[PDB]
Design a protein around this nucleic acid. Structure first.
Ligand SMILES: [Mg+2]
Ligand SMILES: [Mg+2]
Ligand SMILES: [Mg+2]
Ligand SMILES: [Mg+2]
Ligand SMILES: [Mg+2]
Ligand SMILES: [Mg+2]
Ligand SMILES: [Mg+2]
Ligand SMILES: [Mg+2]
Ligand SMILES: [Mg+2]
Ligand SMILES: [Mg+2]
Ligand SMILES: [Mg+2]
Ligand SMILES: [Mg+2]
Ligand SMILES: [Mg+2]
Ligand SMILES: [Mg+2]
Lengths: 151, 100, 82, 115, 102, 126, 100
RNA sequence: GGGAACUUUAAGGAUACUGCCAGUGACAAACUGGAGGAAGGCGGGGACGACGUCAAGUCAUCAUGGCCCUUACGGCCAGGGCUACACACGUGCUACAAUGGUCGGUACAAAGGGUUGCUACACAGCGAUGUGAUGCUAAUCUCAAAAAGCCGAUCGUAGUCCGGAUUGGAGUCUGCAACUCGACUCCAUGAAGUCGGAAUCGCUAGUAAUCGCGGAUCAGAAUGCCGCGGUGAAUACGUUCCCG
């Protein structure tokens, strides 16, 4: 806005793992206020991924999130009637938000029977290093690298 | 509304008041089980033979002050146009503006 | 549809005209405005003219028509195409 | 199996599978299976010849494909020939039960016809 | 662009008028094409059932792809004159706006 | 022995607290029976795990109005107030947690000319 | 064993409270014991009235009327108390029902 | 039987004033960071529309100047129409499914309506309903089943156990009377639709999204309008370019 500084709201930690990050991820998954189904989906995916390799689900999630987080982005600047995409750094909150959104969207566009299965597949793919969220991270790096020249 | 409209409404009400008793008796005879089938049929025929205006279904509510056939608001008996004026003059007891 | 327990509906004047016609033997059409009456089984073989809004259209009542209302055979709108 | 001259799906519960015959819905399928004694969740591939014969005998009691189609067509053509208001609506291919034809009558008149 | 023209009770409207208005308006504003998606013209007679020098009001409102809708009014003694005045004013307004936005 | 009242979104909870083994009843029912949703149970249980003295108390709870989330919030508020009444030294930690505060958020009414409190009809400019 | 039930209905809570206070004072002067006044849920009735003569659906006035009810019991009443209650005058706007 | 504690009900009161502390600014207004408190700097909503603008809307609520008809441009009536259908627009509802459909069990509301009415309960019916009957002029009896939700089973990506338009038979009810032209129930049928051009709309928090419940009009006839509660988000670096 043109004034004020709106403060951020507090997301309570999830029941099972007591993680605010996992609670925020559930909020990203949630639709129409169906948070119970959101938790069911997320926990089913986490159990599925834990089945493949025996590791802490919270540690796996945060490692994959760090893998998928962005580094650099451009914000369009309209001067002289031209786009002038100018690379810039982004705050950690934006980093986490874009990472989570990319993960969820990639899972949604995957092709398994259930949201839990395809979310687990996306987490595994991001851990490996080949996924749609990884591709969006690569593309944003590529474009901010092409336009590095400007400040 | 027109005075002809108002007079038609009044005559309809008068006819309904006139024939209410016979209409009710015929309907009771129709709905009576112990009564004979021929009696029930005759009651049905008489009810169908009653004058049309005796039927309350043919009455339309009207403002009373103006006779308008829309926005009647049973409780007050006035159509919205006159109800607003009477209320906001202070002549309708208990009615105030709403804010909640 | 009208409830069966009430039974079929027919106007008194139309009913009386039909009984007069059947009791006698005359093929003169019965002119009427009761599009809401039902074609009773005793109506068969009679010509009944039914008002359709501005003129009376004839109907020769046959066994098929029993159960329909009179007005179902006298359309009230004139459409020929756009 | 083939019931009433049509091959119903095999890898399916009997109740759902029987509803592939014209003139039988889930209610009629439940009635048929109750009369025979077959459990609804039972799949069609698990039925033997005797059960197929029982189901065919039950289904023969109801009009399914040809009897139902010709009956419906006969009623519609009776209306069209007699010429009642419903018959004229059938003839002109317009809503028969009193819907608006000024707009939204695309399930009877079909794709819109340009002038 | 889709054309939606409306009149009032005084003016009197017909499908012939619809066809003529659509044709003329498209012919005049054919250059912009994709820039513009919707036209709506409206016709009135103000002091209906009387006369005067203008006595008729034409309006045309157009939606340009992108920028916000823009409107124009004109008063004239005849329907044709009102339409021509409104067309000229629309042309001037659109030219000015497009030159401004470049 | 010590009583507390909790309120949240049209829901009201009456909480009675007395030192005991750890029993917890809601409307002649257990927590698992009453709340089939895990978030509600976690919310109900936060205040007494916060003091690390969960099983040294016994609770008798009644609730009316609202839905599952509102009832859970009301029950937690009642437990917090019962603890504050029982001991004065609990209030600073409970407030630091934020349980002492009473949430005042409520549904906003529908408004004339609008589909909902804030949502309004479509104004197309296609 | 005789108990008298008193029910007050009004459109003005100030008037109904005045009436109930007067009733309880009258009972106290006679010397009987009375329970109340007991507030009872208020009825609210809300109406939407168009303010423009012809066409403006969103421009309306929202009015409300409220019905306030109060309950009183008087127990162990004496012959002088009952006669005092009957003798007491009634003010407008407050409909009072007395049940034996 | 009892109690007047608690919830609630509905009148009257208290509280919150930058009141106090640490900073900034002319030592002014005023602005930041804190303690306490349920609540802290207009706490959140609702009514309240300045002088004025568009010969803006309404002679069809009503009143009214001036013109017009007077065995008709007035009055009564029966049928028909306002529901037409080569098409074009605006506002909506339902869907295109697995964050789901079906079946069995099982919890939690708030606001309104009821004597020409709401009706417990038994029977009859697959059902809409019918008969008998009971308590209510209502914080007392009733509409009334809350639904999303949770637990168990099946469905396993198919125009499908998704969708429910259209049509063919059989009925209930309101009413003098359901043909044109009513609402609803049962059996059969099973359409387009597999996520929608350019373009464009709403919304900053108990908000959006989604789920059900009530009312005015009203014999009967809401996907509309006015209200009520349940679950419950995303994002604001900033005003550079977009408009007023
Ligand atoms: Mg007049
Ligand atoms: Mg009526
Ligand atoms: Mg039928
Ligand atoms: Mg004008
Ligand atoms: Mg809501
Ligand atoms: Mg409210
Ligand atoms: Mg003010
Ligand atoms: Mg005009
Ligand atoms: Mg006029
Ligand atoms: Mg007439
Ligand atoms: Mg109309
Ligand atoms: Mg289905
Ligand atoms: Mg297709
Ligand atoms: Mg109604």
């Amino acid at each position: 806005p043109r004034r004020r500084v709106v403060a951020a709201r507090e997301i309570l930690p999830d029941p099972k793992f007591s993680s605010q990050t996992i609670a925020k991820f559930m909020n990203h998954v949630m639709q129409d206020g169906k948070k119970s189904i959101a938790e069911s989906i997320v926990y089913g995916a986490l159990e599925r991924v834990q089945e493949k390799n025996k590791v802490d689900p919270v540690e796996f999630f945060e490692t994959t999130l760090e893998k998928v987080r962005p580094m650099v982005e451009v914000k369009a600047r309209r001067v002289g009637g031209a786009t002038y995409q100018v690379p810039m750094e982004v705050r950690p909150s934006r980093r986490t938000a874009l990472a989570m959104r990319w993960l969820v969207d990639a899972a949604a566009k995957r092709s398994e029977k259930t949201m839990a299965l395809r979310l687990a597949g996306e987490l595994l793919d991001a851990a490996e290093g080949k996924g749609a969220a990884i591709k969006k991270r690569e593309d944003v790096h590529r474009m901010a690298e092409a336009n590095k020249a400007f400040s | 509304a027109k005075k002809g409209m108002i007079n038609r409404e009044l005559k309809r009400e008068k006819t309904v008041a006139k024939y209410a008793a016979k209409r009710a008796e015929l309907k009771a005879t129709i709905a009576n089980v112990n009564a004979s089938d021929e009696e029930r049929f005759e009651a049905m025929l008489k009810l169908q033979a009653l004058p049309r205006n005796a039927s309350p279904v043919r009455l339309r509510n009207r403002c009373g002050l103006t006779g308008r056939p829309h926005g009647y608001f049973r409780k007050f008996g006035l159509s919205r146009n006159k109800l607003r004026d009477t209320v906001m003059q202070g002549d309708v007891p208990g009615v105030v503006k709403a804010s909640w | 549809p009208r409830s069966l327990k009430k039974g079929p509906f027919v106007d008194a004047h139309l009913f009386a005209k039909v009984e007069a016609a059947v009791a006698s033997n005359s093929r003169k059409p019965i002119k009427t405005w009761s599009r809401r009456s039902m074609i009773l089984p005793d109506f068969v073989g009679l010509t009944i003219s039914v008002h359709n809004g501005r003129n009376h259209v004839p109907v020769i009542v046959t066994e098929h028509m029993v159960g329909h209302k009179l007005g179902e055979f006298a359309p009230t709108r004139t459409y020929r195409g756009h | 199996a083939r019931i009433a001259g049509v091959n119903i799906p095999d890898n399916k519960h009997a109740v759902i599978s029987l509803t592939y015959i014209f003139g039988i819905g889930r209610h009629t399928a439940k009635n048929i299976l109750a009369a025979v004694g077959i459990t609804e969740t039972t799949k069609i591939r698990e039925l033997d010849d005797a059960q197929l014969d029982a189901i065919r005998a039950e289904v023969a009691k109801v009009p399914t494909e040809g009897d139902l189609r010709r009956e419906i067509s006969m009623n519609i053509k009776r209306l069209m020939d007699l010429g009642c208001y419903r018959g004229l609506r059938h003839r002109r291919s317009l809503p028969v039960r009193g819907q608006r034809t000024k707009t939204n009558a695309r399930t009877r008149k079909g794709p819109r016809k340009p002038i | 662009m889709n054309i939606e023209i409306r009149t009032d009770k005084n003016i009197h409207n017909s499908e012939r008028l619809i066809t003529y208005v659509r044709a003329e308006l498209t012919q005049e504003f054919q250059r912009h094409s994709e820039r513009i998606t919707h036209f709506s013209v409206h016709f009135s007679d103000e002091n209906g059932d009387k006369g005067g020098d203008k006595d008729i009001h034409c309006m045309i409102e157009a939606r340009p792809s992108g920028l916000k809708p823009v409107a124009v009014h004109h008063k004239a003694g005849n329907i044709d004159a009102s339409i021509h005045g409104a067309i000229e004013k629309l042309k001037r307004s659109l030219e000015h706006t497009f030159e401004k936005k470049e | 022995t010590n009583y507390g009242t909790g309120r949240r979104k049209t829901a009201t909870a009456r909480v009675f607290l007395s030192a005991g083994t750890g029993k917890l009843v809601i409307n002649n029912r257990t927590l698992e029976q009453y709340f089939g949703r895990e978030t509600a149970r976690m919310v109900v249980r936060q205040p007494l795990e916060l003091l690390e003295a969960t099983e040294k108390y016994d609770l008798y709870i009644t609730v009316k109005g609202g839905g599952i989330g509102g009832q859970a919030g009301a029950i937690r508020h009642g437990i917090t107030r019962a603890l504050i009444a029982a001991d004065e030294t609990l209030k600073p930690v409970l407030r630091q947690a934020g349980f002492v505060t009473r949430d005042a958020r409520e549904v906003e009414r529908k408004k004339l000319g609008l589909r909902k409190a804030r949502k309004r009809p479509q104004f197309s400019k296609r | 064993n005789q108990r008298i039930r008193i029910r007050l209905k009004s459109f003005d809570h100030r008037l109904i409270d005045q009436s109930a206070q007067e009733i309880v004072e009258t009972a106290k002067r006679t010397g009987a014991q009375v329970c109340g006044p007991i507030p009872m849920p208020t009825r609210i009735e809300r109406f939407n009235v168009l303010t423009s003569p012809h066409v403006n659906k969103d421009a309306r006035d929202q009015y409300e009327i409220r019905t306030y009810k109060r309950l009183i019991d008087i127990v162990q009443p004496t012959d002088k108390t009952v006669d005092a209650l009957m003798k007491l005058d009634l003010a407008a706007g407050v409909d009072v029902q007395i049940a034996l």
